[PDB]
Short mmCIF file of C-alpha atoms and ligand atoms in Angstrom, two decimals:
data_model
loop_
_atom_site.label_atom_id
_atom_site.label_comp_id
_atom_site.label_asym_id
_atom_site.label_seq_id
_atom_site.Cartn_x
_atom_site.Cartn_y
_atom_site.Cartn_z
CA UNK A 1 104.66 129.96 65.48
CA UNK A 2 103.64 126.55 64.13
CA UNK A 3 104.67 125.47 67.79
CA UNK A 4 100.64 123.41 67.75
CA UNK A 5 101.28 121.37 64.58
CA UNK A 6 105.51 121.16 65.86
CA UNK A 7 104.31 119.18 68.99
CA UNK A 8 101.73 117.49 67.50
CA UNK A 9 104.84 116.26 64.93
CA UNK A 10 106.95 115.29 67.97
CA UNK A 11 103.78 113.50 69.96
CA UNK A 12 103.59 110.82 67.69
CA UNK A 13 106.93 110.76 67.12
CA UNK A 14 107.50 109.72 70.52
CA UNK A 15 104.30 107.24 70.97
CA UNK A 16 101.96 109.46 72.12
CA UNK A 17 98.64 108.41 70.50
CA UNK A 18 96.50 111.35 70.86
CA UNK A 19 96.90 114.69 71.99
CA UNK A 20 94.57 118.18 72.73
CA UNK A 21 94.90 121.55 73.90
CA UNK A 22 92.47 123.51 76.07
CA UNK A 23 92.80 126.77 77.96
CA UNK A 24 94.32 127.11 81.47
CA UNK A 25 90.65 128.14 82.42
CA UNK A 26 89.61 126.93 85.30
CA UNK A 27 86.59 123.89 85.63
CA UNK A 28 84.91 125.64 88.17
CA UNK A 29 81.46 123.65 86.37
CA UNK A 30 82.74 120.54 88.58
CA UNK A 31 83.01 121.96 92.06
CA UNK A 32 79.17 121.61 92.80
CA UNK A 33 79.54 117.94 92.28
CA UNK A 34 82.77 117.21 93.20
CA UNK A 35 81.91 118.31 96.27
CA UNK A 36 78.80 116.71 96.46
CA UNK A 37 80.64 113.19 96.23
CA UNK A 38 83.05 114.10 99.01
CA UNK A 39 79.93 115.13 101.25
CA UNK A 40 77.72 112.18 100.37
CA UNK A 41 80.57 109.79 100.61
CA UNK A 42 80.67 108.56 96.87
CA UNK A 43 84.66 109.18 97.34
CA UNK A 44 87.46 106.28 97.70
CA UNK A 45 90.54 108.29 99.46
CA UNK A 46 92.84 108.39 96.44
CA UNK A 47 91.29 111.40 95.11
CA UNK A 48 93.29 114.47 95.44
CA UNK A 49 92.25 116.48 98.77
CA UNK A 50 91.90 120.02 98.08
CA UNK A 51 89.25 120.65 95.87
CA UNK A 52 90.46 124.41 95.34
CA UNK A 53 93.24 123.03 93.44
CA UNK A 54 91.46 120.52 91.57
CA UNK A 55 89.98 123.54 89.56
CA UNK A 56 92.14 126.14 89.46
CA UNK A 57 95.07 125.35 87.33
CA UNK A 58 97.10 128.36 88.29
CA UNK A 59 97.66 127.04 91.97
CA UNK A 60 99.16 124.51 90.55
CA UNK A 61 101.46 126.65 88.40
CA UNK A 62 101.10 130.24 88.13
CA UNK A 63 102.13 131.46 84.44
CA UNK A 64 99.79 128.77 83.05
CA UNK A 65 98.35 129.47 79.92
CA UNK A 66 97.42 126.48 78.26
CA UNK A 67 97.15 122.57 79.44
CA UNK A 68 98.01 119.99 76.60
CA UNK A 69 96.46 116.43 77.44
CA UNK A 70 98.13 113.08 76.13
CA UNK A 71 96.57 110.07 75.26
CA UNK A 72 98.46 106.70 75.10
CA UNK A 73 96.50 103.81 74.11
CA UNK A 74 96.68 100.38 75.64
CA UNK A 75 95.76 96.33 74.32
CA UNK A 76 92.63 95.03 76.37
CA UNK A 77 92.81 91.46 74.06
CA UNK A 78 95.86 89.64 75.54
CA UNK A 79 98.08 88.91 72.35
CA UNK A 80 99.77 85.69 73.59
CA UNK A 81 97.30 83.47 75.69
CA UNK A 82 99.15 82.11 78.84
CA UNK A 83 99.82 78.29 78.98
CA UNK A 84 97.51 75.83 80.85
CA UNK A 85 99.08 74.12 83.88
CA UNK A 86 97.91 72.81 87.13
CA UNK A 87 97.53 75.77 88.59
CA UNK A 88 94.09 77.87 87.71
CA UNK A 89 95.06 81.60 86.60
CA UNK A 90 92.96 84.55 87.60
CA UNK A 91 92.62 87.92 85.76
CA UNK A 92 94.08 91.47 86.59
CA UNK A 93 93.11 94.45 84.50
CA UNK A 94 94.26 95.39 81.00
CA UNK A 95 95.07 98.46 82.82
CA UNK A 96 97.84 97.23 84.40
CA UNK A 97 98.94 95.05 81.86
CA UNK A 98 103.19 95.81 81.40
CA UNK A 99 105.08 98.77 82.62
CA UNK A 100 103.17 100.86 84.81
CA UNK A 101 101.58 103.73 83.13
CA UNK A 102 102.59 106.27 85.50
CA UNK A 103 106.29 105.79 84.58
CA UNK A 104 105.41 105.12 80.71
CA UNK A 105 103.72 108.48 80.34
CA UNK A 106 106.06 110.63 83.19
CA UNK A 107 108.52 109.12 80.38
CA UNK A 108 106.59 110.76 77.66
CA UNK A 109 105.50 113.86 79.46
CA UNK A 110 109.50 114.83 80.24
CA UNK A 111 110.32 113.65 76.06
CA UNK A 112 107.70 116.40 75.35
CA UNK A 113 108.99 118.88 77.54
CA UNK A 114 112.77 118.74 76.39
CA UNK A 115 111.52 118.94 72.87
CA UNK A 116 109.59 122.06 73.78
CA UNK A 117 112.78 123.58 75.23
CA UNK A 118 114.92 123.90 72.27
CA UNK A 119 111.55 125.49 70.19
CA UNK A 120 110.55 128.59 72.29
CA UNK A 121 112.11 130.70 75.83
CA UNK A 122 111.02 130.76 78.99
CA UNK A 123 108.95 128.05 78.56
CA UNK A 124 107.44 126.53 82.14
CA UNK A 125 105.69 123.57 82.85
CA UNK A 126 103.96 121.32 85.34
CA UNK A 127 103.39 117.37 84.05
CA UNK A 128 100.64 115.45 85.71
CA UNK A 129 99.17 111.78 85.50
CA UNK A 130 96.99 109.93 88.23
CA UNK A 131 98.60 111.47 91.33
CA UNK A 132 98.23 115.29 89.73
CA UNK A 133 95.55 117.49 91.29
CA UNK A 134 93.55 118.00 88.37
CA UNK A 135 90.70 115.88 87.01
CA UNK A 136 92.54 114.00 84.47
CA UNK A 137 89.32 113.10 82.70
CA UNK A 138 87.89 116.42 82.20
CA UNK A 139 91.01 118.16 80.75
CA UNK A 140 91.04 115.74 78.08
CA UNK A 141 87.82 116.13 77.19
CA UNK A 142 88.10 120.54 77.20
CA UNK A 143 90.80 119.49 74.96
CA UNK A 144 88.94 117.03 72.49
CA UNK A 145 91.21 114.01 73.55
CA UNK A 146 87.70 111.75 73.46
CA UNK A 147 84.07 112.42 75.32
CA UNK A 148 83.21 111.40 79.15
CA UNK A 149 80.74 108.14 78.78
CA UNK A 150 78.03 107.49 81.65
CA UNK A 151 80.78 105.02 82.69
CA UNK A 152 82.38 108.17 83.61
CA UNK A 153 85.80 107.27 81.13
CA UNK A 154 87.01 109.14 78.76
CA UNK A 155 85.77 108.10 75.17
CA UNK A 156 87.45 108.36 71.95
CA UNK A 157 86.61 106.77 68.75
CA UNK A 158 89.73 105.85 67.54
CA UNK A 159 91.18 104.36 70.61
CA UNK A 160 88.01 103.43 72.70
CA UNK A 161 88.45 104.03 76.38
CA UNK A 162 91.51 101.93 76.38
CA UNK A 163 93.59 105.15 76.90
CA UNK A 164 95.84 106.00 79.78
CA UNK A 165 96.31 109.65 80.02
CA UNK A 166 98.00 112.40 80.99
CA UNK A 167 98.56 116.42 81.42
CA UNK A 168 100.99 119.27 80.90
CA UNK A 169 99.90 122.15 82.24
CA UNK A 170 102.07 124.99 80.64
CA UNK A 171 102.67 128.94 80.09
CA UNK A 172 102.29 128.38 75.81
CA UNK A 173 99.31 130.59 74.32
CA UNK A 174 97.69 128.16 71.88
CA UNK A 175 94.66 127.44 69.97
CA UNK A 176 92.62 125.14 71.71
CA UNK A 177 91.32 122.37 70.15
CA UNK A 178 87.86 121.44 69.30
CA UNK A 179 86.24 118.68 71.66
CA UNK A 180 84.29 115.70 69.92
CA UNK A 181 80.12 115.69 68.14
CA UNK A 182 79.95 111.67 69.08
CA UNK A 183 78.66 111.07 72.78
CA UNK A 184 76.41 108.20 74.53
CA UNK A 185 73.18 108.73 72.96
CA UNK A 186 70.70 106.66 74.91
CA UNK A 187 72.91 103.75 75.38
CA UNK A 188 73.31 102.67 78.83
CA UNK A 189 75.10 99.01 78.58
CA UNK A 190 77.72 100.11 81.09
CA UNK A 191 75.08 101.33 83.49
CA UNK A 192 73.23 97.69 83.45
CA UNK A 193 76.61 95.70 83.41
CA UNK A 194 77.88 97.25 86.52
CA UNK A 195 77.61 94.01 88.80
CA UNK A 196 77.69 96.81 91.63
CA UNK A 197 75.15 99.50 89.97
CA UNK A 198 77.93 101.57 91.77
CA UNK A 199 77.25 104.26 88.24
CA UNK A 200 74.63 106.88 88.96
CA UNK A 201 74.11 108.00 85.42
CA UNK A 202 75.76 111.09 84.30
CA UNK A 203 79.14 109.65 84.44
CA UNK A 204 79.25 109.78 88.15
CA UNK A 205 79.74 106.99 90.73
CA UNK A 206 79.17 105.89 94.32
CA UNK A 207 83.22 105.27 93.96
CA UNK A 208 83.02 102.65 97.45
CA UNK A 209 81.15 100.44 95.43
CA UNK A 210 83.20 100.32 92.47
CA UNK A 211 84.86 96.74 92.41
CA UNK A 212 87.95 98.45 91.06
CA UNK A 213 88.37 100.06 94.16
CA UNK A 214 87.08 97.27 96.11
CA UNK A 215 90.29 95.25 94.62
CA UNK A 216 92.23 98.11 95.90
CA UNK A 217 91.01 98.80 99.45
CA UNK A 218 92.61 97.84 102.48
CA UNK A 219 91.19 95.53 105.13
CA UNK A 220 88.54 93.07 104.77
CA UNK A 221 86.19 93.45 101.46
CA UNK A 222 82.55 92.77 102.55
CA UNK A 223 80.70 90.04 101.68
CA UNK A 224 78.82 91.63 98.50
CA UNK A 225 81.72 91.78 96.43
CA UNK A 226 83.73 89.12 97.12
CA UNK A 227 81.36 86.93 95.06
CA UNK A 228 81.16 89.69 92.07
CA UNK A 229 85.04 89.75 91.31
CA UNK A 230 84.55 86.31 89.76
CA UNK A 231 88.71 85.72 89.12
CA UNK A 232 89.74 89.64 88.73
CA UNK A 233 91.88 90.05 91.50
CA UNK A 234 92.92 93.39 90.37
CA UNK A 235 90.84 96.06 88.73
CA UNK A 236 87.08 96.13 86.74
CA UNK A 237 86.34 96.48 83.14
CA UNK A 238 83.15 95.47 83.03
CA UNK A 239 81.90 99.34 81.99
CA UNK A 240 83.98 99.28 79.16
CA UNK A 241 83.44 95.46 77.36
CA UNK A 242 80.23 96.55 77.29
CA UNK A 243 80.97 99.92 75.62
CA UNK A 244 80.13 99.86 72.17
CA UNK A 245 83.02 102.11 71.18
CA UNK A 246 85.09 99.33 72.45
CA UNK A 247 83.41 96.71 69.90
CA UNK A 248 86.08 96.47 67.62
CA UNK A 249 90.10 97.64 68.41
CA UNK A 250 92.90 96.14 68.88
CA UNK A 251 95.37 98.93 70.37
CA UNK A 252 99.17 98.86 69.64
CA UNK A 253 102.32 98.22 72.66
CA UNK A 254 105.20 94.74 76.06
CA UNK A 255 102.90 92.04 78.10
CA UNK A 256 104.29 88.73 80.23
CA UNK A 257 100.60 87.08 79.80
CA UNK A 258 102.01 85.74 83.59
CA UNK A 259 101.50 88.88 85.13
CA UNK A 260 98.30 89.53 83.71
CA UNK A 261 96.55 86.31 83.88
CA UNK A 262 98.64 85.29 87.16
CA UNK A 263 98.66 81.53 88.42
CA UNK A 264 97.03 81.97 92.05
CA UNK A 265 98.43 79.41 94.02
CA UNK A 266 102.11 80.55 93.50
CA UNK A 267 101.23 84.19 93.80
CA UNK A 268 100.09 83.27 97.11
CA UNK A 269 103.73 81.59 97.66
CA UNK A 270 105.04 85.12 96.82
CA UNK A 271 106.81 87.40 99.74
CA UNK A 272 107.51 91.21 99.63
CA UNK A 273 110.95 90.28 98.07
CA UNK A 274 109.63 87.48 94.99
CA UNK A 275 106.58 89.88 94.76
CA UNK A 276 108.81 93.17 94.13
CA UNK A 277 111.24 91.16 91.47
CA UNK A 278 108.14 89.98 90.01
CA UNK A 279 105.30 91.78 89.41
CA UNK A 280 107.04 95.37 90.87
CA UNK A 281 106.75 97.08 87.77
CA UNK A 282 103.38 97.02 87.15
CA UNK A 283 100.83 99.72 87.62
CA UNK A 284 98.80 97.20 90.19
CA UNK A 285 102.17 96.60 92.44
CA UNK A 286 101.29 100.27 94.18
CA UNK A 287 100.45 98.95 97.33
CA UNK A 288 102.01 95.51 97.42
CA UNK A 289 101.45 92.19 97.89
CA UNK A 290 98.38 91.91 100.11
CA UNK A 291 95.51 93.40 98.56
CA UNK A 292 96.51 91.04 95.64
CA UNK A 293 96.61 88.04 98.43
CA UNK A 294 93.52 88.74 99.33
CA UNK A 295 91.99 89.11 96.70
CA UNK A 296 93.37 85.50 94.83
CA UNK A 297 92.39 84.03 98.06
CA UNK A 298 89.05 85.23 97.12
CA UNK A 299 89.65 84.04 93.42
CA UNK A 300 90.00 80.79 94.69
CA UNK A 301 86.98 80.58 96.70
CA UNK A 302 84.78 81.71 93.63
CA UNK A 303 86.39 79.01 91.52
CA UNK A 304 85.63 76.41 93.94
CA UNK A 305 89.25 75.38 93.81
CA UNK A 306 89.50 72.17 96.10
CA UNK A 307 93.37 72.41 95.27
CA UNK A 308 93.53 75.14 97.51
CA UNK A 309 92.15 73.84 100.76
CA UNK A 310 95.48 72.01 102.04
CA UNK A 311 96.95 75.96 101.28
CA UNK A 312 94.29 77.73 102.96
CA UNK A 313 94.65 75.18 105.68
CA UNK A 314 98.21 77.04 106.03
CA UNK A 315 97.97 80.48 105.56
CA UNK A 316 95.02 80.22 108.86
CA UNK A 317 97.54 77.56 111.03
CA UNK A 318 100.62 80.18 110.51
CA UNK A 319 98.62 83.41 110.87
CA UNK A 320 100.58 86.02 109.96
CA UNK A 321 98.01 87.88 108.03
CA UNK A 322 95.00 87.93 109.68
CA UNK A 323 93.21 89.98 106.86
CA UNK A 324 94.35 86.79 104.76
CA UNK A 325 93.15 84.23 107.37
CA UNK A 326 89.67 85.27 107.69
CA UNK A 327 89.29 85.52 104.34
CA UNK A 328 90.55 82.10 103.57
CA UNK A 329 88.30 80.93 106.55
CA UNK A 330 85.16 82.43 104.25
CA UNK A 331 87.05 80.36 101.83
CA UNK A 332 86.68 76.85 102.89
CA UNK A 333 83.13 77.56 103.75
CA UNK A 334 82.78 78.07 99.83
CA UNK A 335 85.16 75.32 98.93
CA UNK A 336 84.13 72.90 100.44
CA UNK A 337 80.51 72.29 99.35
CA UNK A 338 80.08 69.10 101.44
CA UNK A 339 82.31 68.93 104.44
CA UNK A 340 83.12 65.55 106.18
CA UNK A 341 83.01 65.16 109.78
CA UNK A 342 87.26 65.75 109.55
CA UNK A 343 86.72 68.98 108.44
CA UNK A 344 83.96 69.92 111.00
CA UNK A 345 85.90 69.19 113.51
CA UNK A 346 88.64 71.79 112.01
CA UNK A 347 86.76 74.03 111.66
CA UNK A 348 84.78 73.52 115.12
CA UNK A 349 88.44 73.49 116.65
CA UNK A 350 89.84 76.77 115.45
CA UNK A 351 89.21 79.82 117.86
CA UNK A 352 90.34 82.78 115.73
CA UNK A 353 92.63 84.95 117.17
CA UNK A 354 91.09 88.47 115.92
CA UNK A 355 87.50 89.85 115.35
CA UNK A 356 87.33 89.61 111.71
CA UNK A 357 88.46 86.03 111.70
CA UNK A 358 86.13 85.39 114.52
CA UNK A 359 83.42 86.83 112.26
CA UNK A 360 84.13 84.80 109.43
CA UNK A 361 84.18 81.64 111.50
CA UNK A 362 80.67 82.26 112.96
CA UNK A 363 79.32 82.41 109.42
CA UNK A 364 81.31 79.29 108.16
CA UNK A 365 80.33 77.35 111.54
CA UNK A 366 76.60 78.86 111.07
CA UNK A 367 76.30 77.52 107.15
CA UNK A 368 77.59 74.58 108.15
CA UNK A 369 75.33 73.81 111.30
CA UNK A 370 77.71 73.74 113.98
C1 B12 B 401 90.21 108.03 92.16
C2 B12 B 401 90.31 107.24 90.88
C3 B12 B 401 89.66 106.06 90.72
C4 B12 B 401 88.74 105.51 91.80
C5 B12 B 401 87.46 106.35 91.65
C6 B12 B 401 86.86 106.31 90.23
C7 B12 B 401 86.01 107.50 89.85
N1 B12 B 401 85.31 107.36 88.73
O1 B12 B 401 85.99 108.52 90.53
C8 B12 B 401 88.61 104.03 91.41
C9 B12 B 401 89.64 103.26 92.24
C10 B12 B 401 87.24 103.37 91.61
C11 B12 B 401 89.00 104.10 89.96
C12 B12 B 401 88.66 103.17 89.07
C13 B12 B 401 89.00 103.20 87.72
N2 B12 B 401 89.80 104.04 87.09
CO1 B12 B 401 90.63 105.48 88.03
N3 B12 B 401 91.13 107.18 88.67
C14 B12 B 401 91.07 107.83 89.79
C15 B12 B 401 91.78 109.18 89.75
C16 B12 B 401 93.16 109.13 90.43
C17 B12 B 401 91.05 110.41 90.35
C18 B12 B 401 89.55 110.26 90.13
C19 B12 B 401 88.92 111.62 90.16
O2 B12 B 401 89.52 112.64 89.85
N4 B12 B 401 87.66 111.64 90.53
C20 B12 B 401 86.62 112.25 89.72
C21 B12 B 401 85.29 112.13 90.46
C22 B12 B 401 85.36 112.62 91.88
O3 B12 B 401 84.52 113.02 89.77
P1 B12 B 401 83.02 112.90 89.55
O4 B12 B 401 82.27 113.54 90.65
O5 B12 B 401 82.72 111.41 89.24
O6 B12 B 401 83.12 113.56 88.17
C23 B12 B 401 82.73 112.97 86.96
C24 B12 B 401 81.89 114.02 86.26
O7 B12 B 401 82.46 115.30 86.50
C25 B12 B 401 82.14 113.67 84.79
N5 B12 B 401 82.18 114.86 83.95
C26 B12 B 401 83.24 115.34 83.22
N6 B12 B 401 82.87 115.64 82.02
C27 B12 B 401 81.46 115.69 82.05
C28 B12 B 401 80.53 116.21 81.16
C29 B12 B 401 79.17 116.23 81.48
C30 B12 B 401 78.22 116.94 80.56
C31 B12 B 401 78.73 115.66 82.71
C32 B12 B 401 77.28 115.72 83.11
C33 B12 B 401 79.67 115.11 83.58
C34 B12 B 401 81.03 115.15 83.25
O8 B12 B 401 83.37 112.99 84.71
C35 B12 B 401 83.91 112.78 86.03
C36 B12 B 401 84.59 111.43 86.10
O9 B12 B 401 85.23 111.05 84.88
C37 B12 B 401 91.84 109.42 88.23
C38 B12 B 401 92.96 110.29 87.64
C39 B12 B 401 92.67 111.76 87.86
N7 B12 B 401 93.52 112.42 88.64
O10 B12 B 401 91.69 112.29 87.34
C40 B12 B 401 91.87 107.99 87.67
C41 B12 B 401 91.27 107.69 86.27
C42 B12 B 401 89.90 108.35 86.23
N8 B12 B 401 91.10 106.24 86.39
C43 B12 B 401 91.41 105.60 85.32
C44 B12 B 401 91.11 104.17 85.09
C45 B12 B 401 91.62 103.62 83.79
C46 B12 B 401 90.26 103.49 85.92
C47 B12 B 401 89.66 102.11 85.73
C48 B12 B 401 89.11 101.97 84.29
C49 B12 B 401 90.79 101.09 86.10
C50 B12 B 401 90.28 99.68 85.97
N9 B12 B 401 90.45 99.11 84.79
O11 B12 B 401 89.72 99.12 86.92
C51 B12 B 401 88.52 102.12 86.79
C52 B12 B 401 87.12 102.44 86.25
C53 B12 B 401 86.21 103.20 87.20
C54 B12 B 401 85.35 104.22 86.48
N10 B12 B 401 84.23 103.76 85.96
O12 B12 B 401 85.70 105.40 86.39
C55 B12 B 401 91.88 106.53 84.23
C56 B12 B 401 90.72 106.69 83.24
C57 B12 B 401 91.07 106.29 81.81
C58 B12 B 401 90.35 107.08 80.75
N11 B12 B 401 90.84 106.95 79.53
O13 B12 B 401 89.35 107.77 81.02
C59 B12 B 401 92.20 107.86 85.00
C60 B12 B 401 92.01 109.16 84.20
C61 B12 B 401 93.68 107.73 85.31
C62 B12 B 401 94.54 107.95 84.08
N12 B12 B 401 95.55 108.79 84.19
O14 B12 B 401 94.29 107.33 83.05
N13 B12 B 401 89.67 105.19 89.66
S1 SF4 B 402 84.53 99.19 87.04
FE1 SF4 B 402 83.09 97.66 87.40
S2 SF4 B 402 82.26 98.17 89.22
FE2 SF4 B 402 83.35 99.91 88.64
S3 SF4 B 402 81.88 101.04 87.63
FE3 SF4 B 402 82.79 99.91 86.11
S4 SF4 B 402 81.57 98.20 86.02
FE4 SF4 B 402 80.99 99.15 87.78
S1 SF4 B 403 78.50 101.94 77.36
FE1 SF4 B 403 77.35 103.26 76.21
S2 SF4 B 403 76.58 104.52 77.73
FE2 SF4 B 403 78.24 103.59 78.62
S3 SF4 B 403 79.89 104.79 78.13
FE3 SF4 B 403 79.85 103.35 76.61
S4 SF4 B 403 78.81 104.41 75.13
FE4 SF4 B 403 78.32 105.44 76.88
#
């Protein structure tokens, strides 16, 4: 007894900077539509598979009881601008700003868990963030962490949407919290500031045209969005600087301003070993290097930066990533607003190897009437 205002004591204690408790009941009001985005194809991949145990808590323990969501808030205003050099810098999501999440809130999850030990018997548990089965952004809501915007994010006044979060799913009877009276209203900024219109509405998505995701598929981005990720190479936040409820915070925890406003012609110098020592740690890192490439190659083009050409010149000659060379093919057709008769006849005179390389070169040799 007392065990709900105990953890609560021992959440902020240990950084946690919001926390809720909802039933074990399952959200069996989502399957209609969760399916729905699987069947019209509104899904990326990285969504967990079966739906079944999406919903049902128990399959995912058994003697669950309760589910107590955490809340750990994150900066989105970089404290410590980086320092101009030669070298323009792009932009990669608040988001992924310092340690990644995943391990910061594991961390947090198993500190809550081993103070829950020594206070009760038997206790069982099951901690979750991201990869977990469940919808991350619904428990928190059942359990008044904050209120789902259109933008689809989870919403609390004191923090904004500038929250990672987190569940443990547990066998603990406990009163449930509340949930929240403040909501959207009529406000729809994020739903006009969406450069993709990828939001439908009712805080649901056609996910393949979010550019976060975009950032984060494999292969070769199309056309459309290559233009629309301006200089974020990692990540969109676009549906939540034009949040009101984001207006005015600043939000507490460390940052290397390097890492999040990265200098794009070095971090295309990186490897899989510089990259790992580097920028390993950070939530962004999950799939390596060459999304990132990619994507500053794209950064580049949408800067115009004639610094890059001799680079880009390079990465096509050596082509070791052809995902990299036809992008930086599209590249110099953006670059390089006026090309001399030198550079027609580079252009003219590569024959690309692949078919998406080929493709881009048609376009470039097309635009520039060859
Ligand atoms: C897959 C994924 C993505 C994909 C798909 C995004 C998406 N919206 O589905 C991509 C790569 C695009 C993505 C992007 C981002 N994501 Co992400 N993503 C996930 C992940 C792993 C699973 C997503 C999921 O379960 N799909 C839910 C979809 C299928 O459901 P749906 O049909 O849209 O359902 C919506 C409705 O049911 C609605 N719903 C619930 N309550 C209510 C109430 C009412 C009345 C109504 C009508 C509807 C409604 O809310 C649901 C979505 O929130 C989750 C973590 C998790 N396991 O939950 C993180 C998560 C949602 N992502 C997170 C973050 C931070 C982001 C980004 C902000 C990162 C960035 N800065 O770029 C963007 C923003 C995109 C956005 N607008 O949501 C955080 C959200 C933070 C927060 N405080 O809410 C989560 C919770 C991860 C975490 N542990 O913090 N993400
Ligand atoms: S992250 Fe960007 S692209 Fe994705 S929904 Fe929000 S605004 Fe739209
Ligand atoms: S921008 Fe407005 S509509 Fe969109 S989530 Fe924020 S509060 Fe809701």
């Amino acid at each position: 007894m007392n065990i709900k205002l105990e953890i609560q004591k021992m959440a902020k204690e240990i950084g946690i900077s919001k926390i809720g408790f909802t039933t074990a009941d399952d959200f069996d009001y989502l399957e209609k539509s969760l399916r729905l985005g699987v069947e019209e194809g509104r899904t990326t991949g990285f969504e967990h598979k079966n739906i079944e145990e999406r919903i049902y808590p128990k399959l995912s323990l058994e003697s669950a009881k309760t589910i107590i969501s955490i809340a750990v808030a994150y900066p989105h205003k970089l404290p410590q601008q980086p320092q101009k050099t030669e070298f323009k810098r792009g932009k990669i999501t608040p988001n992924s700003w310092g340690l990644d999440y995943h391990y910061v809130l594991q961390d947090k999850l198993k500190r809550l868990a081993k103070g829950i030990e020594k206070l009760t018997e038997n206790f069982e548990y099951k901690g979750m963030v991201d990869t977990g089965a469940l919808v991350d952004t619904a428990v928190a809501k059942r359990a008044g962490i904050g209120f789902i915007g259109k933008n689809g994010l989870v919403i609390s006044k004191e923090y904004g949407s500038y929250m990672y979060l987190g569940e443990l799913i547990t066998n603990l009877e406990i009163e449930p919290d509340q949930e929240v009276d403040y909501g959207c209203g009529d406000c729809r900024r994020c739903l006009d500031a969406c450069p993709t219109s990828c939001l439908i509405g009712d805080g649901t998505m056609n996910a393949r045209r979010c550019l976060s995701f975009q950032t984060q598929d494999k292969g070769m981005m199309d056309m459309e969005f290559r233009k629309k990720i301006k200089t974020v190479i990692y990540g969109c936040d676009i549906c939540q600087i034009s949040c009101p409820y984001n207006r005015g915070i600043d939000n507490p925890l460390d940052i290397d301003p390097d890492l999040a406003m990265p200098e794009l012609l070095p971090f295309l110098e990186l490897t899989n070993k510089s990259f790992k020592e580097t920028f390993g740690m950070i939530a962004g890192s999950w799939r390596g290097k060459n999304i990132l490439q990619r994507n500053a190659i794209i950064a580049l083009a949408n800067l115009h930066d004639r610094n890059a050409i001799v680079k880009l010149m390079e990465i096509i000659d050596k082509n070791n990533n052809p995902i990299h060379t036809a992008t930086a093919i599209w590249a110099l057709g953006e670059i390089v607003k006026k090309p001399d008769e030198g550079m027609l006849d580079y252009m003219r005179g590569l024959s690309p190897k692949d078919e998406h390389s080929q493709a881009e070169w048609e376009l470039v040799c097309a635009k520039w009437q060859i």
